[PDB]
């Protein structure tokens, strides 16, 4: 599609495999913001956006957070906190015509810069001056849309390019776009190393009836510490407790006197670790 009418495809309920995307060599630009491409497999996302459009060759750099330009300001705007990846490849074999492909349009003039992630479809005549247009093009009446002159004889920097950008959003919702990872059996009441939809960490998964949690998944504390989590396979409220901490204090007389010690682990009920309490 065109720049001002960029498509957006909803992606959900996926075993998403990005390895085939990474191993393909048909993409000239392969840049990701905030996520390592090799690490896309294990991560889980609640929803994925795929926006596709076609722009000029010199404008591939403009698709980035905090970038300024005609298309950047008036056609497509990225949030400053954008996370995801950007994919672009040349399309002379498909989107170039010797007479000039006139099916691609982009906006020239508009009242003010548009907010990030919003679409403009109105094709009203821009008022460049004071003379009322009244639907009639003329002086002080410029059509905001211009058609790209894409031809196979044109320069490399001007060649048409197809752009597909992937944006990943994360929030407190049941993630539905996961990667090809096998879920193992649950083991509780032991110090384990769990992974609940990308929630990494160690601890013991005791079974606790914390509350109903009719629609909630996570439980938090004063710090950014997930206390209770809801299982993704079944529906139960597990409770995370970190492993045992403490300190090793050494009780010793002077090494001049003798060579003996006595170890003390404080704040440790060492029924599990001449034993005293």
């Amino acid at each position: 599609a065109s720049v001002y009418a960029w498509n957006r495809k909803r992606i959900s309920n996926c075993v998403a495999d990005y390895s085939v995307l990474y191993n393909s060599a048909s993409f000239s630009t392969f840049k990701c913001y905030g996520v390592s491409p090799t690490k896309l497999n294990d991560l889980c996302f609640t929803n994925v956006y795929a926006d596709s459009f076609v722009i000029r060759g010199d404008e591939v750099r403009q698709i980035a957070p905090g970038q300024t330009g005609k298309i950047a300001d008036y056609n497509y705007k990225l949030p400053d906190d954008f996370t995801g990846c950007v994919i672009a490849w040349n399309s002379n074999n498909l989107d170039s015509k010797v007479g000039g492909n006139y099916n691609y349009l982009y906006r020239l003039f508009r009242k003010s810069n548009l907010k990030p992630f919003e679409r403009d479809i109105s094709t009203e005549i821009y008022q460049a001056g004071s003379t009322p247009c009244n639907g009639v093009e003329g002086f002080n009446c410029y059509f905001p849309l211009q058609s790209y002159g894409f031809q196979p004889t044109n320069g490399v920097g001007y060649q048409p390019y197809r752009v597909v950008v992937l944006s990943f959003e994360l929030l407190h919702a049941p993630a539905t776009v996961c990667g090809p990872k096998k879920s193992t059996n649950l083991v509780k009441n032991k110090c384990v190393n769990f992974n609940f939809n990308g929630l990494t960490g160690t601890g013991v998964l005791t079974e606790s009836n914390k509350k109903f949690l009719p629609f909630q998944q996570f439980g938090r504390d004063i710090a950014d510490t997930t206390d209770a989590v809801r299982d993704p396979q079944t529906l139960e409220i597990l409770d995370i407790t970190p492993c045992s901490f403490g300190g090793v204090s050494v009780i010793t007389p002077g090494t001049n006197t003798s060579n003996q010690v006595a170890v003390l682990y404080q704040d440790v009920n060492c029924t599990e670790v001449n034993v005293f309490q």
Epitope: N92, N93, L94, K97, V98
Partner: antibody, heavy 123, light 108 residues
Framework: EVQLVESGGGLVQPGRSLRLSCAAS????????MHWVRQAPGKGLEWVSG????????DYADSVKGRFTISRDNAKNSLYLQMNSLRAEDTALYYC????????????????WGQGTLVTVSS | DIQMTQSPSSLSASVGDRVTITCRAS??????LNWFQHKPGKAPKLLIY???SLQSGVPSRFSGSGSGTDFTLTISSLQPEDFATYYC??????????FGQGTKLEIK
């Protein structure tokens, strides 16, 4: 896996018209360009005509201008080629090729072809 | 108008040989060349679209190269199913889809 079968080959006199068809079944016919190719009995390939994914842009070869009218029917996956005022040099073999893109004049080549239908212009 | 030329006329090799078919374009076409294998008994097929891009569905034995006004096609083995005529087609100049002449390949 795509199939391209033509029809309309026969024997006609010079200056007489005959009508071609070509059936496509192995792909989606509504979003590709189609071309007609001519193979002389004792020469090489030659391009004749092409139509876009929709009936918008149509181009003809220089030697066949004003004589051929390539049509299209997206409903039943079938294109046509009406040849008028045939001469003796048009007794070649005609193929029904498919374009990789959606336009006529693009750097995209012809990916899939079909067995031709031989025509003769003689008495 | 653009003229498209074929250097070889007829070649002969063996089942374990290696030959190269070259095609020269009068004017620069910027790596926009295509190669077709036209078996005389049935419909022609496509081997390499673009300068050196190999279409899915044919063995990776074939390999193309060249840009500008010089191009070349090579076959590494010439297996007993490779006897056919090969054409080079340009898709960059105003005359649409100019084909080069044939190049018969009979292994003996």
């Amino acid at each position: 896996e795509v199939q391209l079968v033509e029809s309309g080959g026969g024997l006609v006199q010079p200056g007489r018209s005959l009508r071609l068809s070509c059936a496509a079944s192995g792909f989606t016919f509504d979003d590709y360009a189609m071309h007609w190719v001519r193979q002389a009995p004792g020469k090489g390939l030659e391009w004749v005509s092409g139509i876009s994914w929709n009936s918008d842009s149509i181009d003809y070869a220089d030697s066949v201008k004003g004589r051929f009218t390539i049509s299209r029917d997206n409903a039943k996956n079938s294109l046509y080629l009406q040849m008028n005022s045939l001469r003796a040099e048009d007794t070649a073999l005609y193929y029904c090729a498919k374009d990789r893109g959606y336009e006529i004049l693009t750097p995209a080549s012809f990916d899939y072809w079909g067995q031709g239908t031989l025509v003769t212009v003689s008495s | 108008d653009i003229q498209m030329t074929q250097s070889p006329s007829s070649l002969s090799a063996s089942v374990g040989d290696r030959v190269t078919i070259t095609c020269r374009a009068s004017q620069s076409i910027s790596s926009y060349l295509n190669w077709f294998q036209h078996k005389p008994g049935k419909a022609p097929k496509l081997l390499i679209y673009g300068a050196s891009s190999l279409q899915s569905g044919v063995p990776s034995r074939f390999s193309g190269s060249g840009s500008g006004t010089d191009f070349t096609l090579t076959i590494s083995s010439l297996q007993p199913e490779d006897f056919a005529t090969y054409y080079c087609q340009q898709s960059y100049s105003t005359p649409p889809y100019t084909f080069g002449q044939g190049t018969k390949l009979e292994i003996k």
